[PDB]
Amino acid sequence: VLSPADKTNVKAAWGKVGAHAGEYGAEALERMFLSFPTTKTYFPHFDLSHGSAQVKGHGKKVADALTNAVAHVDDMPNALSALSDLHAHKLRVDPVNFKLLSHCLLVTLAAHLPAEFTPAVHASLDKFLASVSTVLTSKYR
Amino acid sequence: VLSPADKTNVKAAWGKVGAHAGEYGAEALERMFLSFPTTKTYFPHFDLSHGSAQVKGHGKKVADALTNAVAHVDDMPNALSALSDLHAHKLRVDPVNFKLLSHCLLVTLAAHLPAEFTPAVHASLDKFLASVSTVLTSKYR
Amino acid sequence: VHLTPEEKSAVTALWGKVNVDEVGGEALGRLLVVYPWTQRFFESFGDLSTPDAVMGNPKVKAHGKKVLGAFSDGLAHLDNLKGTFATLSELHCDKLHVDPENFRLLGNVLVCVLAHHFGKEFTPPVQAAYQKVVAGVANALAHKYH
Amino acid sequence: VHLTPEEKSAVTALWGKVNVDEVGGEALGRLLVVYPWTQRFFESFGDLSTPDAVMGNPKVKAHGKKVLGAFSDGLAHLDNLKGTFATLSELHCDKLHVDPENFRLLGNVLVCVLAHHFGKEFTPPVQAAYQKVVAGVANALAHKYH
């Protein structure tokens, strides 16, 4: 559950991320495969090397979903029904993995936003990533 | 996020608790305090003896909250709003404990509603308690 | 782990009445129903598309027996759960990489199954004794991580 | 932990640039702002009402410096983290009863803090190495729960 403040915070920081979302989404994925190689088991057919055009493209995809979630913060369950179907029902991703991409995405943002990643932003972005994770790990269809 | 099946299952089940709610909430609590001694740090002044009338009284309030939680299953943040402040704002309860009480509610239920505690219902009930717990652990006011 | 002698007897008494052909399957099945992501780990069991499918799956009931057995062992070596499960921890940690939280979830569904079958007999005190064994087994299994 | 030859080198190189009077408080600081229930353990620290109170709090800075010191110790004994953290594990597990999950959260926001400071220098490979450390440490602090 996001407080009006969390939403204000999320929309604000995500705006700051601006055009760089896809990039960050890709850097997040890479940080995760490196730090937690077990996550790689989910992307067997992907080329997970550093410059992977595949990882870069999947990254834009992860970011647009987030940008979408940020845009429908009040209506995420409905907003992300497809993705939830994909992750919860279809891929059955261990929810432990979301805390990992979440952490890697925060770390990514911490490394790119030395001027805007404030404790409050960090906190709101964490709660936000957690909701998103809760939605994609719930079989509510 | 609860599926429509979950709301069905949860209501079917919890409704069978009826007049038993206060008792079951008490038993869950006791089960919790006995099984996970640390949970007792949140009730230091509390008389937690086996028959504690205080415990029985408290479990009545807990169990009723859950009934109200079930009723407004599509609006728990508004419904449980006050309980959220209490647990998250005021009590600063560590989220882990909500997993223990939940499990204890579940054990209590299973011990009392053998026929109703089917895998599917046990599944909804877990999800349900997982939502209540999320709400009660989120600061949004 | 430490079980008072009075506890070890309550646990022991109860477990002697446990249906060793079914309990493990009920527990494994509910794990998969209640925590669907765990299914990814047993996808070769076949049809697990629904609760009844899961609970009705033969490989689930079959494999469940091994699980219960492991629990019977630890229950017979509460003094050395870590060593008793060294081989299982190697399997679940190095080969499968099952998140250690899942080990805790299975122990807990076992506890719900025991409550489900014994009803009122599974008293708070007896449950607490079981939460000790169960947490110890999960810890033992996660040893290869620790 | 493991840490390859080049890894420890990176960890070490980076830590040399860590400000020991500030980072500790930045992490313990964010631990409290981001994971608000952790504040339940620091009531004796004073005003933690807002992120500004938390971050600018004297006791949070002074304590965090100690936390940072436990990490530095770890870095000097990567091949014996559990031994290094034995005392702390008793304190955090038996005395304070801090759920091990928070040991993991502190370690991660630490990483975020390190990331926030080093920016581009905190590369995925560098982060990867630090996750190893922070995982050893957390596991070490939780040893008393195993």
Ligand code: HEM
């Ligand atoms: C907030 C977290 C996450 C978001 C927003 C997210 C979003 C997405 C999106 C947008 C897709 C594209 C699917 C399509 O083309 O329709 C996708 C696919 C996928 N996601 Fe995630 N995801 C998240 C977490 C996870 C986690 C942590 C894992 C597991 C480690 C994961 C594994 C997958 C896999 C394996 C695919 C399919 C990739 C492929 O085969 O092309 N996702 N995700």
Ligand code: HEM
């Ligand atoms: C299923 C989740 C839970 C529900 C539905 C619930 C509900 C409630 C309710 C109804 C109250 C009493 C309000 C009143 O009497 O006016 C309350 C108080 C309280 N709860 Fe919870 N609770 C939950 C989880 C927890 C957990 C996990 C803990 C900690 C182990 C906890 C600790 C407390 C404490 C410390 C109080 C205050 C007792 C006092 O000072 O009188 N609760 N809760």
Ligand code: HEM
């Ligand atoms: C509570 C702790 C658990 C116990 C006592 C336990 C015990 C066992 C035992 C006895 C085996 C058979 C080993 C052999 O003879 O080769 C096994 C295999 C296995 N377990 Fe566990 N297990 C536990 C939890 C889990 C969890 C939580 C998962 C993952 C969701 C899991 C996934 C597996 C897998 C994949 C196998 C092999 C299945 C296959 O044949 O394909 N186990 N476990």
Ligand code: HEM
């Ligand atoms: C890797 C993580 C952690 C490390 C390395 C660590 C390290 C330390 C150290 C060095 C001390 C001070 C020892 C002294 O008394 O001189 C300490 C004390 C303490 N820690 Fe931690 N800690 C960690 C995580 C946590 C977490 C997650 C919590 C709980 C949210 C926590 C709560 C406390 C408390 C309450 C004290 C005593 C403070 C006081 O009353 O003065 N610590 N910690």
